[PDB]
Amino acid sequence: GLLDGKRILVSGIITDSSIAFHIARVAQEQGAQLVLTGFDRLRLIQRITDRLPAKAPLLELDVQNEEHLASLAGRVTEAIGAGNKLDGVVHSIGFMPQTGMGINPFFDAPYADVSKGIHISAYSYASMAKALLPIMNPGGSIVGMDFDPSRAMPAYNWMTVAKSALESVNRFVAREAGKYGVRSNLVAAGPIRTLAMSAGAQIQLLEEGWDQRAPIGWNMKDATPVAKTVCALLSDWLPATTGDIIYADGGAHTQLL
């Protein structure tokens, strides 16, 4: 039980292909007691979370909603029992409107759309940390999901910009979280077939290039390797790593080709 008796909040489950879902699954297999947050289709999310190996309370959280953030810590402590604190927080939340992504030209995305995407994808990592650090134990771990944005690439467009912002936000969260003995890190995943992927020739070349570049290969169908990596960061086995990015991408980013 890598996470034996750790209390861990996990956001961002929308389907059972969600990366968050597999993080939640692997964490429970490893003895973690979870609290879960879900955004919009709460009834649907409850049905999806029923398929996890264990029961976990489900709280409503719209990261754009200031009231939800203000009430979050109180709602969490109620669910885990007063006197108890969190050892773990997982941010697995991303969004960018269609105008900011894919076939749509980079220059045509209006700021309102980009701003919303940045709000949800980058700024929310800080506001979740603000809301939850007060109910976190020393030795604890905050973890967010990243996609390496250090080089530009077709299609990913303004979401790349959002991820660049996130990485920077992560380094500042690490400063604040350090005052509580809490670590903050990001996991940079290779591409994964999720619901979000749903929203062409260049993206396929990027994927296949992925497996080819990855010295141990990469399998877009399998979220388990990134779930494990996130669990490794939630654990006590990376105690001197903070403000940082761990690459769970088959090693692809270390190879030019």
Numbering used by the authors: 3 to 201, 212 to 269
From the study:
The frontline antitubercular drug isoniazid (INH) targets the mycobacterial enoyl-ACP reductase, InhA. Inhibition of InhA by INH–NAD results in impaired synthesis of mycolic acids. Here, we report the identification of the diazaborines as a new class of direct InhA inhibitors.
Compound screening against purified M. tuberculosis InhA identified three initial hits, AN2918 (6-aryloxy-benzoxaborole), AN3438 (5-aryloxy-benzoxaborole), and AN6534 (7-aryloxy-N-sulfonyldiazaborine), which had inhibitory concentration (IC50) values against the enzyme of 44, 12, and 79 μM, respectively. AN2918 was not active (IC90 > 200 μM). AN2918 (6-aryloxybenzoxaborole) had activity against InhA that did not translate to M. tuberculosis activity, whereas a close analog without the para-CF3 group was inactive against the enzyme and M. tuberculosis (data not shown), whereas AN3438 (5-aryloxybenzoxaborole) was active against both the enzyme and M. tuberculosis. To understand the binding mechanism of these boron-containing inhibitors, co-crystal structures of AN2918 and AN3438 with InhA were solved to 2.5 and 2.55 Å, respectively.
